Amino acid sequence: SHSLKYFHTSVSRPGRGEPRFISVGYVDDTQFVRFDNDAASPRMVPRAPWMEQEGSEYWDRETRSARDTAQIFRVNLRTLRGYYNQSEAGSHTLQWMHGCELGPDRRFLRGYEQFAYDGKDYLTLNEDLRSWTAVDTAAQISEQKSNDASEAEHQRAYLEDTCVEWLHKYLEKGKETLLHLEPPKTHVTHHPISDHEATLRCWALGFYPAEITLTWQQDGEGHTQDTELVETRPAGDGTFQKWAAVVVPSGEEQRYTCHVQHEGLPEPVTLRW
Amino acid sequence: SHSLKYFHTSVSRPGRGEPRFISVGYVDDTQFVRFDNDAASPRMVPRAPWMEQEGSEYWDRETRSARDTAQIFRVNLRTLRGYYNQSEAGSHTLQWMHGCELGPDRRFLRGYEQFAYDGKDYLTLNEDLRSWTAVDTAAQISEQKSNDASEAEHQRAYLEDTCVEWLHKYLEKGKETLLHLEPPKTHVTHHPISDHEATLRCWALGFYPAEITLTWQQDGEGHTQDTELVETRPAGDGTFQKWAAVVVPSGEEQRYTCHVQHEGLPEPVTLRW
């Protein structure tokens, strides 16, 4: 299973004129390109080395799409300000995200798309990819407007063909990294709290992709009667890391075991201390 | 043969802020609606009585299309200023026109669309209605841009279906006027110049539609040697008028006759002084 998805964000600035706009693209968990109008180079640039061997036709074409989009969003922004009777004095945000996913069969599986204003679901493309859905009694107009203009039509086109076709290309141009799995370096740490309790912290480092599972088990049994878990975080080198802890009564340390599941592992792993 | 066509105009106002924008719609030679942003009431309004019996859904919907359009043009305006390296200090014009025509069979015949900047052909929709055509080296970008976005696609949709469907409706709702033929009131006038020459002026008033033909001819043979003709002009009541004059030797007036052709006439008409 793989995916190609973008995340566009537009933020209004009352004083500074033109709204800030940013687009970033991803393949699975890897950002590969991006656009930012507040950058020295207001154009689409690579964020992954395996992109660098692309022609100027590409970068120019993409830079256009991006620019046009920034404009339409500028409009949409004022349009919305209208729908909600808001003043040009406040700041506002409009976000849009879309992606297409491939199944195991390496063929189209599902696609999606949706907008959101001031951090709230606004409009959404339906599963069938042929109809929209206002999700805010304000989005109502925007709904029909789009349904008359038949916008839904080619969005489906892009998602179904273009998106896929290119996703493949990207997978090839970046196989080395994209398709390369990197299993986690594991280990446990002991941290005494009181005279009767200590803390076992199961670590997992430098892994990829980000999907992973850590679980604390006593004498075969299950557990979390003190299992604190932290949100998977980025290492900063392209890989991730995550840890799960649990408070245990001293001298009973051997009883507990940490289980780790990751696609990069031939089979799960169990640690103990 | 009938037609439904609009004419949108956008003019930049250095200083006054937002560019002036105006849309007007016509069925054959009759203007029926219009939009103007400067106007006290900025929204789509009727220009023909036979429109007044239309629901608020209509007027609201149209007012939206108009508004959105004024926005995109505002953008297009700056965009173009770019393509040509022009300053915000000068004024500029962007015009767009489109129409669909019905044949005698009362079915789709032809459709069209084209833009123009500062009074010069800029971009154009091809006959097949599936491709654009830069008509300047600047429009080159705009060409592909549109061809990638597949704008041509639904423009064709509108033209082929929507445009037609509605044209019909308009014909019915206004049959009483749009279908009533109004033949011209004719007559000749004598205007002596010297004791030797005089001017014969063949008049044609209050007719509709505007298509018409006036021909001065001597002894039944065609003529041009002193045929001054004026461009068909509007009466101001919905009908038109036009006249053709010719200088003739005093005494030879009987040799001259004016011929008039108009769809509202069972057969052509011959006038002599």
Binding site: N76, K145, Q155, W166 | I72, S150
Partner: peptide, 9 residues
Amino acid sequence: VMAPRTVLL
């Protein structure tokens, strides 16, 4: 690549 056409709300 990013979609060639966005939506007019």
